[PDB]
Write a protein that binds this ligand. Structure first.
Ligand SMILES: Nc1ncnc2c1ncn2[C@@H]1O[C@H](COP(=O)(O)OP(=O)(O)NP(=O)(O)O)[C@@H](O)[C@H]1O
Ligand SMILES: [Mg+2]
Lengths: 47, 385, 906
């Protein structure tokens, strides 16, 4: 992704994570209330 | 009971909500700077930079120049450069200077100093009225002079007489003078500044009058107002070093208070209350008699006064209810309410020696005899002839 | 201890010195090991009951912990004894508290969780018998306090509550909800609940409204209705018991859904009706708005004695005080039916007498001549504004008013306002009609209109007297072809008739007179005026207004201002109901525009009132939503956006206002604390958002009716000099009125200093001068609180035109409207039969910080203040009635009520 693609991605999550909890919580509650590193390459053929 | 709970439930939906709103609103989509800030910011940095020397503003000359003093000893004929307008500045304020070239780059400090901290009190005092028991009449003299003109000047106008201004509280330790002042002020719900006199006098030269002038400015803005200057008696005619000095700096601070008392603005709507031993401790000079008007001589508690004051104290000592309020009064020798404070302390002191597990009727009675005995012992028999 | 020999009665004596520990092996080992031994336990039962109480007075933890170790099964839980049926039912009684000692005397979270199930099954089963009723009572009422019972009774009663709590915490409830493992219903349980309510009335205060609310049922209130009528007299004196009841009801309000909220009130009303004081009953009857309820309180007063006596005098007067006037109907009705004196009682129900007492107060206070007469440029306009507000209420100003010079030298919309503000000299007073009519019959169309606005305001206290009615005059003037004469004419129609719903008036104002097709803001006043007429009773939630709102808004939307006026009109109409306000919301939302979405946020704040648990969150989700989308993008078509925003801003502040005022006094402090931090959020998020919120913020104060009218407004106002807008000051001041020349000594001092300070605008100076002048009022002049007074929880009928005008940026046009500010509090006077408009004494408490008293009843020592004391705002507002000195007792209780006092003098 390199540095550019990362920076957008990261800020992008952060907005949505805060924004979900900031509204989802208040509505919902009252809705209701009322390895083989060493593993070489498998000996199987591959194309 | 129930009502308290209600307030807690409301807080737990208010603060939780608030925290989250802030994050989303200030930044994210909306943006915290939203372009305009970014512009101001770039300019501000240029003009500035660290370090920045805090200053004191002596006078403004309308011509975009000012006369400032810094930490360093010589003064500076400096230019005002942008930011704070001349109007929005007040002389006597602490101001922001840029260090390389000293120009007024703003203000944010506003007499950032512990003195300011101690003086300001925007709410009314902790003492509500005639919780204090006895000297009723006395406290209903301080109310005639202070309180009554702020609440209604109408009555004074109609008589054809200036409202009284000022009271001077004087007399004797033990009568809870200081307390009466707080009491009267609370009823008024006057903005009740309060200060210790010891702070206004210091060794360093010329800081004293700055501070003193400021008290008077803050009070007039927030009129109707009471200024309570506690321990005016401190300053007195104490003179640090009797070789020389104490006849320079000390004298200058006293002067300033008086020059502003009547002032260049009419502050008849600023009452003053001076708590003091006597005015003869000070070099007498309290200007305008009718401007300090009625003076209040505290008598010490008498027989009826100390009943009420007693009643508070005995409720703290466990099981002293057994001994009738009246008969406690009778059996002891006539003494001041202060000496009740000494007596009440004596009861607990004896309970501690005994390892009296719970305070009893027997302790409170024993307490009288030892307390009375202390006072007689301390007295010196010179023999009435 | 637990030994086999200690099942013997030789061991009573040896154990008992330290503490009986005999009882453990006798009801554990003997019982479990055989069912043939159950018959033998029966005789030994009575010794065991005696010993149980001694072990609570000799309570210690080691001899319950150490001994019991297998009780749990033996009782019923697993052994499942019941071979002799009757035998184990009686042996429930000692074992149930012993078990509770391993719940509590032994501390262990784990043991607490496990035994929750076991204790509740054992309590329930035996509460049907009412021999378990006998266990609780004997401990609660014993004279001598002890360690053992003192915590254990508390664990027993949490279970009761628990059971009804099961319906709320989970949807599953009953025995599925395994907090208690026991269903809340059943004859056995219903028998146990009912009993306990009697005990905790005497001893507790805060668990009575928790049980009611948690059940969720009006069935809980039906059980309480009956027990409370029995306990009113013997437990405590009536007056004291009534005061406790009233606190409990307001508590139930937050966290009850809208259809149910009102229904709890009707069951409550039944308790009150039975209890003696019919003073308390009427408050709820007004609140509901129901004709049935309002009727039953009256009928109850008048009829029980056929002699006129105090009863009839009382009945008429309680309805009389209220300036809505819907209440006047009931009295007029009873009076036409009766004929003790048709002349006297009909006036006394009528709103003629509230005018009459204002004339009387005036003589005491002396008439104030202070009114401005200034001319030239802007000061010409400023003088017209000051005239009205400074002399608000009935207050002779004959001399300045006779001066026609200043009136006629005014020009523009200002010329109309000059005559409108003379009307406000004679506010709520018959007298001063003559002056307005002088103007009306001469010169410019301007002062003609203005005369009409003035008539409207004066005739207000004749909302239901129908003496020289406005309706007769003002109709002819609608028909006049010029737009200015017409508009004025119909707004007077509104103000004159108040909330009193008169068919001839309602139908006069029912079509907007002028063509809807026209975009004019002179026919805005049709919707504004009609709204007022609707408030103060069950709203019809009329369909005509809704339908026509949509049509005019689509057809012409150029004047952004025009259509805002229409949206606020709906919001005002709906005040005092949220049941039917929900239904109409769907109609609004069905159709869509950003213009429609503006109306939507605003009516929702009104909707969700009757519970602040729901309301507040709604109008803070909302607050974000407009901002956020626009932010996203930024990172005549115009009108649509603008509206969207401006309403959103207003609705934020409104939902708080509707909560704190209607509901609990506790929230008054929570919303005040929340408000200031909420300005700051909005300031960071938008520069533009700040300015709109600031105005509504000073209105937060007046509408909510904060406790403190001294310190906190003054502090606020200093900050709001620096900020843009000074229309914030005008709303702020109506709260600031207080006991003048304390608050209002500061006010004049602040405004004039800052105008001097920086003349940033002449416009700014203007709003600064008018607001400080309005603040001060002389010789205890009548004041206006938005609160009904009588109903401290209440909301105004006609002080919601300030709400209309806060929203829209002030204009020269709008300043005429503001003269209207009718909702003046009446001076209190002692009565009985004399109907003397004077009082010996009345006590006040100078401070207010009470919120335990939702009543706002003060300590009765008080501080005595003379005759003709206008019922001052908050920090003075709680009022007790002085006359015991003369041997008189209030029969009409005051609790900072607006009401004129009445005693039965011995
Ligand atoms: N009417 C009164 N008001 C207040 N305190 C009183 C009164 N009468 C007697 N007292 C007693 O005086 C005590 C407090 O007095 P205190 O604060 O020592 O004095 P002061 O007169 O302000 N002196 P200083 O110690 O020089 O500042 C109270 O705790 C009472 O025991
Ligand atoms: Mg002192």
């Amino acid at each position: 992704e390199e540095a550019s693609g990362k920076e957008v991605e990261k800020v992008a999550t952060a907005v949505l994570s805060t924004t979900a909890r900031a509204k989802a919580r208040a509505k919902k509650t009252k809705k209701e209330k009322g390895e083989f590193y060493k593993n070489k390459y498998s000996s199987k053929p591959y194309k | 009971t129930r009502c308290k709970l209600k307030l807690l439930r409301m807080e737990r939906i208010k603060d939780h909500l608030l925290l989250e709103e802030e994050f989303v609103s200030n930044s994210e989509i909306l943006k915290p700077f939203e372009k305009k800030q970014e512009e101001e910011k770039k300019q501000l940095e240029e003009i500035r930079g660290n370090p920045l020397s805090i200053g004191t503003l002596e006078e403004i000359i309308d011509d975009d120049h000012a006369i400032v003093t810094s930490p360093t000893m010589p003064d500076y004929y400096v230019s005002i450069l942008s930011f704070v307008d001349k109007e929005l500045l007040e002389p006597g304020c602490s101001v922001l200077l840029h260090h390389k070239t000293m120009s007024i780059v703003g203000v944010l400090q506003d007499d950032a100093d512990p003195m300011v901290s101690v003086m300001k009190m925007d709410k009314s005092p902790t003492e509500s009225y005639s919780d204090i028991g006895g000297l009723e009449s006395q406290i209903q003299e301080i109310k005639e002079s202070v309180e009554l003109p702020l609440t209604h000047p109408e009555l004074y106008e109609e008589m054809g007489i200036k409202p009284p201004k000022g009271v001077i509280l004087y007399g004797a330790p033990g009568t809870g003078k200081t307390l009466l002042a707080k009491a009267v002020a609370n009823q008024t719900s006057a903005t009740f500044l309060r200060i210790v006199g010891s702070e206004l006098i210091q060794k360093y030269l010329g800081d004293g009058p700055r501070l003193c002038r400021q008290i008077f400015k803050v009070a007039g803005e927030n009129a109707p107002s009471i200024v309570f200057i506690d321990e005016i008696d401190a300053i007195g005619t104490k003179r640090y070093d009797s070789n020389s000095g104490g006849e320079r700096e000390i004298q200058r601070t006293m002067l300033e208070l008086l020059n502003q008392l009547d002032g260049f603005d009419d502050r008849g709507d600023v009452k003053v209350i001076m708590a003091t031993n006597k005015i003869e401790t000070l070099d007498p000079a309290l200007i305008r008699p009718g401007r300090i008007d009625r003076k209040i001589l505290f008598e010490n508690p008498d027989l009826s006064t100390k009943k009420k004051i007693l009643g508070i104290h005995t409720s703290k000592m466990n099981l002293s209810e057994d001994v009738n309020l009246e008969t406690l009064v009778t059996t002891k020798d006539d003494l001041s309410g202060a000496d009740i404070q000494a007596m009440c302390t004596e009861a607990g002191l004896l309970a501690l020696r005994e390892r009296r597990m719970q305070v009893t009727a027997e302790d409170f009675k024993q307490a009288k005899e030892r307390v009375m005995k202390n006072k007689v012992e301390e007295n010196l028999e010179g023999l009435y002839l | 201890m637990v030994d086999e020999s200690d099942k013997k009665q030789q061991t009573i004596d040896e154990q008992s010195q330290i503490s009986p520990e005999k009882q453990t092996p006798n009801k554990k080992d003997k019982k479990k090991e055989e069912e043939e031994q159950l018959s033998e336990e029966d005789a030994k039962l009575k010794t065991d009951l005696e010993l149980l109480v001694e072990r609570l007075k000799e309570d210690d933890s080691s001899l319950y912990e150490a001994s019991l170790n297998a009780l749990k099964e033996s009782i019923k839980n697993s052994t499942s004894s019941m071979t002799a049926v009757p035998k184990p039912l009686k042996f429930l009684r000692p074992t149930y508290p012993d078990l509770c000692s391993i719940y509590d005397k032994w501390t262990d979270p784990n043991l607490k969780s496990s035994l929750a199930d076991v204790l509740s099954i054992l309590a329930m089963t035996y509460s049907e018998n009412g021999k378990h009723d006998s266990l609780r009572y004997r401990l609660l009422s014993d004279v001598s306090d002890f360690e053992g019972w003192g915590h254990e009774y508390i664990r027993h009663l949490a279970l009761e509550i628990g059971e009804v709590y099961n319906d709320q915490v989970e949807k599953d409830a009953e025995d599925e909800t395994s907090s208690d493992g026991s269903k809340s219903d059943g004859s056995a349980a219903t028998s146990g609940f009912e009993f306990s309510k009697e005990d905790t009335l005497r001893l507790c205060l805060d668990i009575v409204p928790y049980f009611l609310k948690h059940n969720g049922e009006e069935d809980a209130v039906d059980l309480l209705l009956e027990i409370e009528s029995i306990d009113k007299l013997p437990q405590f004196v009536d007056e004291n018991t009534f005061q406790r009841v009233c606190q409990y009801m307001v508590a139930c309000v937050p966290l009850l859904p809208p259809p149910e909220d009102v229904a709890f009130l009707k069951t409550a009303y039944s308790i009150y009706l039975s209890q003696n004081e019919l003073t308390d009953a009427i408050a709820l009857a007004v609140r509901l708005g129901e004709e049935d309820m309002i009727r039953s309180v009256f009928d109850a007063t008048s009829d029980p004695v056929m002699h006129k006596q105090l009863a009839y005098i009382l009945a008429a007067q309680k309805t009389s005080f209220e300036y809505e006037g819907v209440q006047d109907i009931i009295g007029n009705g009873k009076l036409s039916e009766h004929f003790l004196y048709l002349a006297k009682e009909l006036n006394l129900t009528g709103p003629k007498v509230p005018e009459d007492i204002y004339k009387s107060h005036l003589d005491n206070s002396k008439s104030v001549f202070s009114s401005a007469g200034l001319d030239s440029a802007q000061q010409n306009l400023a003088s017209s504004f000051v005239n009205g507000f400074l002399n608000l209420g009935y207050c002779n100003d004959k001399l300045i008013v006779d001066n026609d010079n200043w009136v006629y030298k005014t020009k523009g919309d200002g010329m109309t306002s000059a005559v409108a503000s003379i009307g406000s000299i004679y506010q709520w007073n018959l007298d001063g009609l003559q002056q307005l009519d002088k103007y009306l019959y001469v010169d410019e169309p301007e002062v003609k209109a203005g005369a009409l606005l003035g008539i409207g305001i004066s005739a207000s206290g004749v909302h239901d007297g129908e003496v020289e009615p406005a309706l007769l005059l003002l109709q002819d003037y609608v028909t006049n072809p010029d737009t200015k004469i017409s508009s004025a004419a119909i707004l007077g129609l509104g103000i004159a008739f108040a909330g009193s719903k008169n068919d001839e008036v309602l139908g006069l104002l029912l079509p907007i007179a002028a063509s809807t097709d026209l975009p004019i803001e002179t026919a805005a006043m049709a919707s504004l005026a009609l709204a007022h007429v609707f408030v103060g009773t069950c709203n019809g939630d009329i369909t005509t207004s809704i339908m026509d709102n949509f049509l005019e808004r689509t057809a012409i939307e150029l004047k952004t201002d025009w259509v805002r006026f229409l949206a606020l009109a709906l919001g005002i109409l709906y005040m005092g109901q949220g049941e039917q306000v929900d239904d109409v919301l769907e109609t609004i939302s069905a159709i869509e525009h950003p213009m429609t979405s503006a109306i939507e946020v605003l009516v929702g704040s009104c909707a969700y009132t009757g519970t602040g648990d729901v309301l507040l969150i709604q109008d803070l989700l909302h607050r974000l939503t407009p901002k956020n989308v626009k932010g996203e993008e930024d990172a005549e078509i115009k009108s649509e956006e603008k509206k969207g925003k401006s309403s959103d801003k207003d609705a934020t502040t409104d939902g708080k206002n509707d909560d704190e005022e209607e509901e609990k006094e506790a929230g008054i402090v929570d919303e005040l604390a929340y408000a200031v931090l909420g300005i700051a959020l909005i300031a960071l998020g938008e520069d533009i958002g700040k300015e709109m919120s600031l105005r509504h913020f000073g209105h937060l104060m007046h509408y909510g009716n904060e406790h403190i009218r001294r310190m906190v407004p003054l502090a606020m106002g200093i900050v709001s000099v620096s900020d843009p807008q000074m229309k914030v000051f005008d709303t702020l001041t109506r709260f600031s009125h207080d006991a003048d020349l304390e608050v209002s000594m500061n006010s004049i001092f602040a405004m004039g200093l800052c105008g001097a300070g920086t003349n940033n605008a002449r416009l700014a100076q203007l709003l600064r001068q008018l607001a400080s002048y309005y603040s001060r009022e002389q010789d205890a002049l009548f004041i206006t609180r938005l609160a009904q007074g009588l109903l401290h929880l209440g909301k105004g009928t006609m002080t919601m035109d300030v709400f209309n005008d806060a929203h829209v940026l002030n204009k020269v046009t709008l300043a005429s409207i503001l003269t209207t500010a009718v909702g003046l509090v009446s001076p209190s006077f002692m009565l009985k039969h004399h109907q003397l408009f004077y009082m010996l004494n009345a006590g006040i408490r100078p401070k207010f910080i009470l919120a335990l008293n939702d009543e706002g009843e003060p300590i009765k020592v008080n501080v005595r203040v003379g005759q003709a004391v206008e019922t001052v705002g908050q920090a003075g507002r709680p009022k007790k009635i002085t006359g015991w000195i003369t041997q008189s007792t209030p029969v009409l209780l005051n609790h900072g009520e607006r009401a004129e006092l009445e005693t039965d003098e011995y």
